């Protein structure tokens, strides 16, 4: 039934001695991997606690060992067996008793479901509970389970360690695989939750492995095909058992896979040579996480020294001895004393945990006893009355060293901190085909990157980023898809990227560079005489300078002889100055100064043109008045119209400020690399047209009066010369107007109007001086 | 200890027989309002079940009555006593047994905490439970508590009924008041949750009433002052006990309150005369919800017929007899038999609920027994082995009539549906000062609006809507504040409301109406001769029509006399037609037709203006050539320039399409009701300027020609007449330009330009007509 140990204070015990069998009987056959060893460990722990005078010197500690048979309902009934001893008041019945057996705490509930049941039934009675093998993450809410403690970390910490190894090594794609039950599902669920909370990691695959049959070998192919769909995902995490991964490796080998994606192992994988077989090539480079293992020396000596007649408290020892050696009292066994020799047994890794659990219970009870009473040698009566939340609070705050090197403690939630060491498999170049230690995980991840290479490769050989990092000078973040990985699209070349996150439009009037760092147009467009067509007008202007160097040559000496006196002296001075004025105007407009000094230039062509025709205007009237029937009079009338032209530009300056702007924008998308810029002062088509139109108005009223001049027998050579010039002048004016219309649609017209205007002035002036200087050469040769 | 009744099948019982007293003893004195009455009701229910052959004919039913002492821990201890009889296996001890007592179900757990505790301990062992007095809303989750049932509705249904009464009657502002404990807080919490889910209602006040003292009388003033802050909130809901509301009403009465806001009562209020005293005026009109009450006849007769010697199963009956009459075996009582005579006791309202609970349990067991086995007369062995979820499933699906008229049923969650009836207080017009029924609430709210008149006025006198309807013809919805109630603001007057929730801009080119329903501008602006200043030009045009009937009068007969022959015949015909052409032009421009007929009018002043000066042009040239030294030739040269004017309008027709648009937009914000509109064809400032500017050139030439003509000794009156007219027209043409510019900035210049143009054309022709008039009168005199 149950082992009973005498003592003034006792604590209960739950262990899975037997295993469930058919549907009828609750439990059938016994199990040796976890059945008897844990009981013997607890018995040894109690014995050496009672022997040690350091802890509980004057007071002893008892216990009540008991089995659970791995059944939820059976566990509930047995747990009720602990508490009924104190709850029962009395029984009104007689047949024709026993000590109260006051329990203080309970140690057991190895599984998961039996743990939840015992916690739920002992939360109501307020009794502390410490488990040693319960790894389910559900038993982690303090509010849901008040009186509950664990000395073994849950799977949440394992998930945290894995996501830390993935993050540190550098990866983005991870595939989750799990087996049936309540272990694989919860492990991957915790893994996804941590990844989403921490950020920077995502899940791309999610497959589930049922267990409806064992002779299929088809669903494995389906999942390996599902995983092979994306060649980029080269890292997977597994939560399944050894058989599942063994089949997965076998399928990968028979499928002749070349990518050889990496594996990340879970506690089920660990460090065991059995699973790996003929798959050493494909399993290489697997990162596995395994709990630390420690071997004690006292328990092994204790268990190896016990025999049938030595101890009688244990009720299952005889049945274990029968089942271990397979002999019943058709083979009989008497006094073998070879338990540690015939069977090559090895102690399990949970022995240290039950020993530590008993230690934590004893230490908390000792501290509570010291604080409750210190003036009493033995057991003070106050201790029996005091119990409940006080003992739980003392259990939470404890810190000491147990059998293993590592200490034991409890955090806020109530579970022990996770401590693991990372292993890896290397065979192609390692001296030892076995696993080698590469790092540890206690509170912060500590891993040696350069220590792991698995041969013919650098430690960061695999890459799983879901996108090649685009940094060629163009970048942009797209919200489409999961935030995990980003896709970049080439945005226009007419602006640069802003904050490496978007393609904003850069300010105008300046082109962008090539690497998308700045938006500036260094090159500019300036007019040149040699390169553009402006050389020919420049040459024409130079040719005109030679002509005026000869007309004025025979003027300095020929000023008093009675030969030139036929022509008016006052008129001769007007034409001399008018010819020189237009020569300087063509030279000024050819030049393009950057500064706002064009004001002195606009008057050269605006006001300088009137004084050129002024002499011609009064000359026709003077020779016409003698035909119809005071030299200073003709001088005054021409001087007046000069004031009109001179005052015409003065009022223009008062109308609007003469602001000069050199900035210009091409605004052409055909060639983003091209940047056309033009600088001009007061560039208006109407301004140049109306200024030039003044001379045309006065020329019309003069030509009409010149029709009757033809045929007068006064000066045959002079009359015939003037008539020829008139037709030429109107020709160039009439062709000027059609030019600007229907041509300014392009962007290169800023420098073509200047050139054609330059030759127009030279041509109109050359014909004027040609006929004027014709009579001058007569007195030279003749 | 506990009453035990023999039977093959038994069910447990929990009742609060005793009450907790000092800290030491769990329970002290007994209570008679709920202690013994419920036990006797259950005993009477069991007896009549055993007597009735309809249910369980061949099989009897037992029970185990037991007390809880209103302690959670004691309830746990008793629950363990219920379950141990079947869970315990054996005990290895001897003293020098009892029936197994297999329980099937449990009826009890009146309170709330003891209910939660019993549910938690019996959920694990899978035993059904039915409660009768547990009203907490926490015990309503099927997943939290599997094996649990209630025959009394929870407070969630009460909250649902209240929010239905508030919504149906019409209200928006409600204030929540609650008392201490886990009853008031949960009631208002449910009320808030339903209101937020259903929508259309809100909470504006939330106060809490502590219970640390009873002699303060300050917190009541604090809350009543907090409630009196907003006069709009005239409806409040209360969840407190009778003492609290009694204090609240007293404070309202002593505070001299005039608003007299309404009250909504809860189950604690009910229909009693105790809660009202001298506050009848201010408490009038309180809507209270109460559960239905029914009185049975069998239990009362059963209880009134029992004495000490009649029944011995009950163990607390003797103590109850002692405490009821206050006699101990220093006053002794023997055989009074006046339990129902000395004390005017009345049964409680929960008797029917325990009777129904027992009925439901009996029916479910009978159905399960009938369904499991039907070929056996007595108790079939299958029933003992069958138990667990099956009995719960049969309990959920049951429907029958109990002691009361209403049936009992369970929904999916597991609690009975709510049934209440609405009461109200009236003491002004009603003959009976007590409450009167006004409606019922079982599944849908059924309330008689016209049957309730509180405050000595119309029924729907009070309203609390946070605001007036605010529908003056336009509205806007404001998101600020809680969506429950809204605030309205007047939006701009230039558009109407859209969807009665926003003020969007209506299409322009018209005006909105005053009621903000449509956006249309019916009125238009048209030029009138009578109202605007256009009368004077119209009169001037009529005057000119009379004048021209005199110039052509003396032309038909005076065609052969040797007096008129001095003037040119061809010239006379030119001026005769020109005068009539301009007369028709001024009349056409005066009229404003909407149709596309203005094309014939623009030519009257375009082409008809040149023909007027054409005769004047060749007239001066003809008299000018005889001074410098073929009538048909002079006719031809004038006919040529007329063709130029005729072709001038022709090329304008092909240049741009003659599109006529009558629509116009004032776009004036000064007067939103004003809508100015002008319809003109080909309204262009430059078109009218250039058409009139053409004649200026020829007139200027004629002016200079006539000026030089003066001084010729040829004519006396004719030369003087033509000299004056050349000096009169220049004045009006020079003044026409100043008024044209710097004045078009307004919108009323569309009709002022025509009027001044009409008078200008008339006066420019009258001077010529007057010049022709002088020779006419001269020849008449001569």
Swiss-Prot record, chains A, B:
Q: Which residues face the membrane's Extracellular side?
A: 1-533, 592-597, 656-685, 743-757
What residues bind L-glutamate, as annotated? 112, 133-135, 183, 267, 350
Q: Write down the superkingdom of origin.
A: Eukaryota
One GO BP annotation here? Answer: axon development
Q: What does this protein do?
A: G-protein coupled receptor activated by glutamate that regulates axon outgrowth through the MAPK-cAMP-PKA signaling pathway during neuronal development. Ligand binding causes a conformation change that triggers signaling via guanine nucleotide-binding proteins (G proteins) and modulates the activity of downstream effectors, such as adenylate cyclase that it inhibits.
Q: How does it assemble?
A: Homodimer. Interacts with PICK1.
Q: Which disease is it linked to?
A: Neurodevelopmental disorder with seizures, hypotonia, and brain imaging abnormalities: An autosomal recessive neurodevelopmental disorder characterized by global developmental delay, hypotonia, severe to profound intellectual disability, early-onset epilepsy, and microcephaly. Neuroimaging shows cerebral atrophy, thin corpus callosum and hypomyelination in a majority of cases. Death in childhood may occur.
User: What is the name listed in the Swiss-Prot or TrEMBL entry for this protein?
Assistant: Metabotropic glutamate receptor 7
Q: Which organism is it from?
A: Homo sapiens
Q: Gene for this protein? A: GRM7
């Amino acid at each position: 039934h149950s082992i009973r140990i005498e003592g003034d204070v006792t604590l209960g015990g739950l262990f899975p001695v037997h295993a469930k069998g058919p549907s009828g009987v609750p439990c059938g056959d016994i199990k040796r991997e976890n059945g008897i060893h844990r009981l013997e460990a607890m018995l040894y722990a109690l014995d050496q606690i009672n022997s040690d005078p350091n802890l509980l010197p004057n007071v002893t500690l008892g216990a009540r060992i008991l089995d659970t048979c791995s059944r939820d309902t059976y566990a509930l009934e047995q747990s009720l067996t602990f508490v009924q001893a104190l709850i029962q008041k009395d029984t009104s019945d007689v047949r024709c008793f026993v000590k109260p057996e006051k329990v203080v705490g309970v140690i057991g509930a190895s599984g998961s479901s039996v743990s939840i049941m015992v916690a739920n039934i002992l939360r109501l009675f307020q009794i502390p509970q410490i488990s040693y093998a319960s790894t389910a993450p559900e038993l982690s809410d303090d509010r849901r389970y008040d009186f509950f403690s664990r000395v073994v970390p849950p799977d949440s910490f394992q998930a945290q360690a894995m996501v830390d190894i993935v993050k540190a090594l550098g990866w983005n794609y991870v595939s989750t695989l799990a087996s049936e039950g309540s272990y694989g599902e919860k492990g991957v669920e915790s893994f996804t939750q941590i990844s989403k909370e921490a950020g920077g990691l995502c899940i791309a695959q999610s497959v589930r492995i049922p267990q409806e049959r064992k002779d299929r070998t088809i669903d494995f192919d389906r999942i390996i095909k599902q995983l092979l769909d994306t060649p980029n995902s080269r890292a997977v995490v597994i939560f399944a058992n050894d058989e599942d991964i063994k089949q997965i490796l076998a399928a990968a080998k028979r499928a002749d896979q070349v990518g050889h994606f990496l594996w990340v192992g879970s506690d089920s994988w660990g460090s065991k040579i059995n699973p790996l077989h003929q798959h050493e090539d494909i399993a290489e480079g697997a990162i596995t996480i395994q709990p630390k293992r420690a071997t004690v020396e006292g328990f092994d000596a204790y268990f190896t020294s016990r025999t049938l007649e030595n101890n009688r408290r244990n009720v299952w020892f005889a049945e274990y001895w029968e089942e271990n050696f397979n002999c019943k009292l058709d083979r009989k066994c008497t006094g073998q004393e070879r338990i540690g020799k015939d069977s090559n047994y090895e102690q399990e890794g949970k022995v240290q945990f039950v020993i530590d659990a008993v230690y934590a219970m004893a230490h908390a009870l000792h501290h509570m006893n010291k604080d409750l009473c210190a003036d009493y040698r033995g057991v003070c009566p106050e201790m029996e009355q005091a119990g409940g939340k006080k003992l739980l609070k003392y259990i939470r705050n404890v810190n000491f060293n147990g059998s293993a090197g590592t200490p034991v403690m409890f955090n806020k939630n109530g579970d022990a901190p996770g401590r693991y060491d990372i292993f890896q498999y290397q065979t192609t170049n390692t001296s030892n085909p076995g696993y080698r230690l590469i790092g540890q995980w206690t509170d912060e991840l500590q891993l040696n990157i350069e220590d792991m290479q698995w041969g013919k490769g650098v430690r960061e050989i695999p890459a799983s980023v879901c996108t090649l990092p685009c940094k060629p000078g163009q970048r942009k973040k797209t919200q489409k898809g999961t935030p995990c990985c980003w896709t970049c699209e080439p945005c226009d070349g007419y602006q640069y990227q802003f904050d490496e996150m978007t393609c904003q439009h850069c300010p105008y009037d300046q082109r962008p560079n090539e690497n998308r760092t700045g938006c500036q147009d260094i090159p500019i467009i300036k007019l040149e005489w040699h390169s553009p067509w402006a050389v020919i007008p420049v040459f024409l202007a130079m040719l005109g300078i030679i002509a005026t160097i000869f007309v004025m040559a025979t003027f300095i000496r020929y000023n008093d002889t009675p030969i030139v006196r036929a022509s008016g002296r006052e008129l001769s001075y007007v034409l001399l100055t008018g010819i020189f004025l237009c020569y300087i105007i063509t030279f000024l407009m050819i030049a393009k100064p950057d500064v706002a000094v064009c004001s002195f230039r606009r008057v050269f062509l605006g006001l300088g043109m009137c004084i050129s025709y002024a002499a011609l205007l009064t000359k026709t009237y003077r020779i016409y008045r003698i035909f119809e029937q005071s030299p200073t009079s003709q001088l005054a009338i021409t001087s007046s119209l000069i004031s009109v032209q001179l005052l015409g530009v003065f009022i223009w300056f008062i109308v609007d400020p003469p602001n000069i702007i050199i900035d210009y924008d091409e605004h052409k998308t055909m060639n983003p690399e091209q940047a056309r810029g033009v600088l001009k002062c007061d560039i208006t088509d109407l301004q140049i047209i109306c200024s030039l139109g003044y001379s045309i108005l006065l020329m019309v009223t003069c030509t009409v009066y010149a029709f009757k001049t033809r045929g007068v027998p006064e000066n045959f050579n002079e009359a015939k010369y003037i008539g020829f010039t008139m037709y030429t002048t109107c020709i160039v004016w009439l062709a000027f107007i059609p030019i600007f219309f229907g041509t300014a649609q392009s962007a290169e017209k800023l420098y073509i109007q200047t050139t054609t205007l330059t030759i127009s002035m030279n041509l109109s002036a050359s014909v004027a001086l040609g006929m004027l200087y014709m009579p001058k050469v007569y007195i030279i040769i003749f």
